[PDB]
């Protein structure tokens, strides 16, 4: 009960902070107002990256014992990135279990995800195909693929 | 070689007077009045969602003092 109360109080205050004082580069909120542990987020491809301009929808699912344990993140929008599994799951070090700490917030996680789009982690990638293209042909096929992802994401954003 | 940053000095924040019954379409129309951005250039974002023109601020539980995110077509 205490654990469910602590996790809810933190997520609630974070949500209230983002409703009034959003951070540039992303928007985050509840999928259903009655569920504080299932978030959806829109992430803008950061400048000076191959993802620049993309509008990336993702889900962020918190456990009941947050902040002791991290949330899980999954891109809904299709994306081509070494640390993003084919199913959309985001495998990065800050979400394991540079590591996870009970001080990290939604904002802290988005900062890491945005940096991820600029600098993938080369240790144990989730998309070996994308990882290979990023190491060997970054400005060729990889850039071409990511460009498609970006175009498709902007299409659904202005539908 | 070194690195520097450049930010706009102009306040990018837009202030609007709205009612909870206003639709997202009406809000985009008010944004045009102040900044002159055609509605079909804007998409409004809040609580991690692409706000749809036909829904109201009340439909998205947007309260007073809340801040909406503005997405623009890149040219």
Swiss-Prot record, chain A:
Coiled coil: none annotated. GO terms for biological process: proteasome-mediated ubiquitin-dependent protein catabolic process; protein K48-linked ubiquitination; protein K63-linked ubiquitination; protein polyubiquitination; ubiquitin-dependent protein catabolic process. PROSITE patterns: UBC_1, UBC_2. Widely expressed, mainly in skeletal muscle. It catalyses: S-ubiquitinyl-[E1 ubiquitin-activating enzyme]-L-cysteine + [E2 ubiquitin-conjugating enzyme]-L-cysteine = [E1 ubiquitin-activating enzyme]-L-cysteine + S-ubiquitinyl-[E2 ubiquitin-conjugating enzyme]-L-cysteine. InterPro entries: Ub_conjugating_enzyme (IPR050113), UBQ-conjugat_E2_core (IPR000608), UBQ-conjugating_AS (IPR023313), UBQ-conjugating_enzyme/RWD (IPR016135). The modification N-acetylthreonine is found at residue 3. Its EC number is 2.3.2.23. The keyword Transferase applies. Disulfide bonds: none annotated. It is an enzyme of class 2 (transferase). Keywords: Acetylation, ATP-binding, Nucleotide-binding, Transferase, Ubl conjugation, Ubl conjugation pathway. Residues 6-155 form the UBC core domain. GO terms for cellular component: cytosol; extracellular exosome. CDD domains: UBCc_UBE2G1. The keyword Acetylation applies. The modification N-acetylmethionine is found at residue 2. The active site is at 91 (glycyl thioester intermediate). It holds the Pfam family UQ_con. Accepts ubiquitin from the E1 complex and catalyzes its covalent attachment to other proteins. In vitro catalyzes 'Lys-48'-, as well as 'Lys-63'-linked polyubiquitination. May be involved in degradation of muscle-specific proteins. Mediates polyubiquitination of CYP3A4. Belongs to the ubiquitin-conjugating enzyme family. This is Ubiquitin-conjugating enzyme E2 G1. It comes from Homo sapiens.
């Amino acid at each position: 009960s205490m654990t469910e109360l602590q996790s809810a109080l933190l997520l609630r205050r974070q949500l209230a902070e983002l409703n009034k004082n959003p951070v540039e580069g992303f928007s985050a909120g509840l999928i259903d107002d009655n569920d504080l542990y299932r978030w959806e987020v829109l992430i803008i491809g950061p400048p000076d990256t191959l993802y620049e301009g993309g509008v990336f929808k993702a889900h962020l699912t918190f456990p009941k014992d947050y902040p002791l344990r991290p949330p899980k993140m999954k891109f809904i929008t299709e994306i081509w990135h070494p640390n993003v599994d084919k199913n959309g799951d985001v495998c990065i070090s800050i979400l394991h279990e540079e590591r996870w700490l009970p001080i990290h917030t939604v904002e802290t996680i988005m900062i890491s995800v945005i940096s991820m789009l600029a600098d993938p982690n080369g240790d144990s990638p989730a998309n070996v195909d994308a990882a290979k293209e990023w190491r060997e042909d970054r400005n060729g096929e990889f850039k071409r693929k990511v460009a498609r992802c970006v175009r498709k994401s902007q299409e659904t954003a202005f539908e | 070689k070194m690195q520097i940053f450049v930010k706009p000095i102009r306040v990018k924040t837009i202030t609007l007077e709205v009612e909870p019954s206003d639709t997202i379409e009406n809000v985009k129309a008010k944004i045009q009045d102040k900044e002159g951005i055609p509605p079909d250039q804007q998409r409004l974002i809040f609580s991690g969602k692409l706000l749809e023109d036909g829904r109201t601020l009340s439909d998205y539980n947007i309260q007073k003092e809340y801040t909406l995110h503005l997405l623009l077509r890149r040219h």
